[PDB]
Amino acid sequence: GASRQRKLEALIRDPRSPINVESLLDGLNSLVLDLDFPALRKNKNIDNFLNRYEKIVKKIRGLQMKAEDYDVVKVIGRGAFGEVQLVRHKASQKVYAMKLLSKFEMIKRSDSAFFWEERDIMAFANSPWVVQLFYAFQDDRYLYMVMEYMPGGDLVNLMSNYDVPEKWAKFYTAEVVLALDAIHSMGLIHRDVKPDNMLLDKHGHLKLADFGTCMKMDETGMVPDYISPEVLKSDGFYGRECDWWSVGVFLYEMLVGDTPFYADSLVGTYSKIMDHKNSLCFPEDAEISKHAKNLICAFLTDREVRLGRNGVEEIRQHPFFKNDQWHWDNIRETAAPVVPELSSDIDSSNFDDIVETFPIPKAFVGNQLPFIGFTYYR
Amino acid sequence: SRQRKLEALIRDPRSPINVESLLDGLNSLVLDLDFPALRKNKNIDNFLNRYEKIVKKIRGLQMKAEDYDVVKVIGRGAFGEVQLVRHKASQKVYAMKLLSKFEMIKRSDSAFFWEERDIMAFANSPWVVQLFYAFQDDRYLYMVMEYMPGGDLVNLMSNYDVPEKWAKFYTAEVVLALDAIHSMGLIHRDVKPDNMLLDKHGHLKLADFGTCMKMDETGMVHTPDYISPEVLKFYGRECDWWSVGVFLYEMLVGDTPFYADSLVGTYSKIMDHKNSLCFPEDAEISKHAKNLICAFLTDREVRLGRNGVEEIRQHPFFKNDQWHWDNIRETAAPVVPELSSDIDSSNFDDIEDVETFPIPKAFVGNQLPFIGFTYYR
Ligand SMILES: COc1cc(C(=O)N[C@H](CO)c2ccccc2)ccc1-c1cn[nH]c1
Ligand SMILES: COc1cc(C(=O)N[C@H](CO)c2ccccc2)ccc1-c1cn[nH]c1
Numbered sequence A: 001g002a003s004r005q006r007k008l009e010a011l012i013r014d015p016r017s018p019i020n021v022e023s024l025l026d027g028l029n030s031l032v033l034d035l036d037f038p039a040l041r042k043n044k045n046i047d048n049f050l051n052r053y054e055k056i057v058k059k060i061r062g063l064q065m066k067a068e069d070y071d072v073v074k075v076i077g078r079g080a081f082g083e084v085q086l087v088r089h090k091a092s093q094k095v096y097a098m099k100l101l102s103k104f105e106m107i108k109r110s111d112s113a114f115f116w117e118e119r120d121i122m123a124f125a126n127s128p129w130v131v132q133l134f135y136a137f138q139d140d141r142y143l144y145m146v147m148e149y150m151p152g153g154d155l156v157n158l159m160s161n162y163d164v165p166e167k168w169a170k171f172y173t174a175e176v177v178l179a180l181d182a183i184h185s186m187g188l189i190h191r192d193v194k195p196d197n198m199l200l201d202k203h204g205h206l207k208l209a210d211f212g213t214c215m216k217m218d219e220t221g222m223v224p225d226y227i228s229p230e231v232l233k234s235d236g237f238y239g240r241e242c243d244w245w246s247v248g249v250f251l252y253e254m255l256v257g258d259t260p261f262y263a264d265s266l267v268g269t270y271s272k273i274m275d276h277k278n279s280l281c282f283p284e285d286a287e288i289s290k291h292a293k294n295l296i297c298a299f300l301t302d303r304e305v306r307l308g309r310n311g312v313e314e315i316r317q318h319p320f321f322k323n324d325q326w327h328w329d330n331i332r333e334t335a336a337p338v339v340p341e342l343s344s345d346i347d348s349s350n351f352d353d354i355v356e357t358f359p360i361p362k363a364f365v366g367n368q369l370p371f372i373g374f375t376y377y378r
Numbered sequence B: 001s002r003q004r005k006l007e008a009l010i011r012d013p014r015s016p017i018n019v020e021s022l023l024d025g026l027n028s029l030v031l032d033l034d035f036p037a038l039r040k041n042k043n044i045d046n047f048l049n050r051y052e053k054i055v056k057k058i059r060g061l062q063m064k065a066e067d068y069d070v071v072k073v074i075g076r077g078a079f080g081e082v083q084l085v086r087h088k089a090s091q092k093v094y095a096m097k098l099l100s101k102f103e104m105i106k107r108s109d110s111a112f113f114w115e116e117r118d119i120m121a122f123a124n125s126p127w128v129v130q131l132f133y134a135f136q137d138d139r140y141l142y143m144v145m146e147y148m149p150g151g152d153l154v155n156l157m158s159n160y161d162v163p164e165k166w167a168k169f170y171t172a173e174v175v176l177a178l179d180a181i182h183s184m185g186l187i188h189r190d191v192k193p194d195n196m197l198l199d200k201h202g203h204l205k206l207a208d209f210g211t212c213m214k215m216d217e218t219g220m221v222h223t224p225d226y227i228s229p230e231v232l233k234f235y236g237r238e239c240d241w242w243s244v245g246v247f248l249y250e251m252l253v254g255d256t257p258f259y260a261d262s263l264v265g266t267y268s269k270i271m272d273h274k275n276s277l278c279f280p281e282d283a284e285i286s287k288h289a290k291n292l293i294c295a296f297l298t299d300r301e302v303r304l305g306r307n308g309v310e311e312i313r314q315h316p317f318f319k320n321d322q323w324h325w326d327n328i329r330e331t332a333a334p335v336v337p338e339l340s341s342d343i344d345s346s347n348f349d350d351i352e353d354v355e356t357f358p359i360p361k362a363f364v365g366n367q368l369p370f371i372g373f374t375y376y377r
């Protein structure tokens, strides 16, 4: 009997459950947002429901986390459906990185499901290789993701400010290897491994960000300059090995100073990637070891014989990673090659310097419906 | 903290945003969107796809009509019926009141159940029928109450000639039950013996609160035989005290004080109450009983109970050697029900025995006025 009430009480407590209390409050909020228009309020059912919940929903909005609770310090990133702002929480004075996503642009450009795995990865990974999400909240215009601020900037910035030695390339590669294996363990494929999505923490250690491209792998494990050839030839099924192709490209860019399939045109890069058997060649002036060259070549092969298919053990014991500084079991607790020297809690010097509204409707449209359940409070 | 303030609102059972009300909101949204005409909208089709599984799971876990077994229909009314039911799992017997959502919407009366549910769930008075569970489906609102096997006072009057010692007891119980409702800032507006039930021991409890209204700052607000003249022509608490006088008259005399063959004749007799009220020469009634009926059947301005329940309490009619106002409900009742089983419905007459909602093209929101009805004790 009350075993059913116990089963139900458990679902509502579970933070991964779609019917948790934050997700149930999202349902109420979204229903009020999509009905409070004078055209719709002509309906007696709608006008009377909105009159009943008007007071409580005003009270709830004032209590719940909102963008007004934070001060915007600077825009440190921009992307497809939004921007990432360096913000300071007004009450606690704590500094975070907050990612905003336009609800309007996600509906219009019919791309409105990518944020679910991005939010889940950052909120629940519990890995030092993934940027941690503290709070996810939404208003009538945007989705917000308050994550830990990474003051070391991305690996693109590092490469443009330093001539990268093989000892540093061996460190950042190992960290990318472990970070990807952590994502693959959570049953996901990044699909966009690149140095713009590799951030450095206050101590110079890597963390992955921008999970908008992730996909949960099915039972078989299946789903521009850094894209794999098998992904380019698309619609077909690809696996974890496409993420390791991106690692090969990254290690080449680090040591050589240019991407292996760089071309002046977009089509030229595609052409070079497709012809990877004949287009991949190391410059005669490039400072690279035989082990480093041999590792890049094991990643830049056809998917069938690529390194990393039979797990990450084959990658771990590659001769390139032989060193006298770290082990795979402690690399993140060893001293990083470059440690950030920051002047304040809002020093954003490792980041380069960087609105269409919904139309009032006549009939029920339900623009808030695809966002019910986004709110999360740690 | 703000999160502590918010967590308190959701725990409060009187709060419109409690967990049962928040689950009602989700259920009602799914019910009002799952139509193939509406599902043509991408937002709607995708939302329904996401919550389809979990809402099927939630419905199976939550209390439903299929958890109860219908024993007999013991009452029928305006928008539904009251069924004697037995909970399949616990084997406990209850009285379950059903209200058609369709009829409530159609006959544009869809707010009366909020005070009926609140009165029965939260009164905490032995004079009010207790509600244990309120729940709903796509067709009805359900109210699981304590079953009253003694039947109503109409049934008692039709099976017994009422002596003044019995009339003094039942009146005193109506007086205390009405004072309890008035204490909660409510006016019944429909005091009559059909709405007075007797428990397993013969003690009164009030039922059918569909006519109740919360009184404003001054104590004011906005059935043919028991209606007051002021309602026939803002009304206060003394409006319920009129119905008590009519009740005491029907008990002692055997007929209504303003009974007429026509509805217009009854409406005329009530308006001319100053000259139409007279006690039959063959009626066995004391001077005190006659004088009490007359203090209730006056113009609202000078009616007994206008200046409090203390005035009614001290009336000479209630002088007796059996009970006191502080213990009447723990004294022996005049008629104690003789029941054969937990489902003996012999003190209730037999009840003699299809409109569904139309499938819509656009969002109508027929479930919206019912969000927050679910209550679990
Ligand atoms: C720039 O910093 C970030 C960027 C991102 C991120 O996902 N960026 C992309 C494009 O760069 C994007 C996509 C969609 C909308 C906007 C932005 C995620 C975390 C941080 C971060 C974490 N801690 N500190 C900074
Ligand atoms: C018959 O017993 C009841 C009746 C009612 C009641 O409110 N009845 C009216 C008129 O019939 C009605 C209104 C709307 C729909 C249907 C019926 C309320 C409680 C009981 C009851 C019995 N035991 N415990 C509680």
Ligand SMILES: [Cl-]
Pocket (backbone or CB within 6 Å): A321, A322, A323, A326, A327, A328
């Ligand atoms: Cl090693």
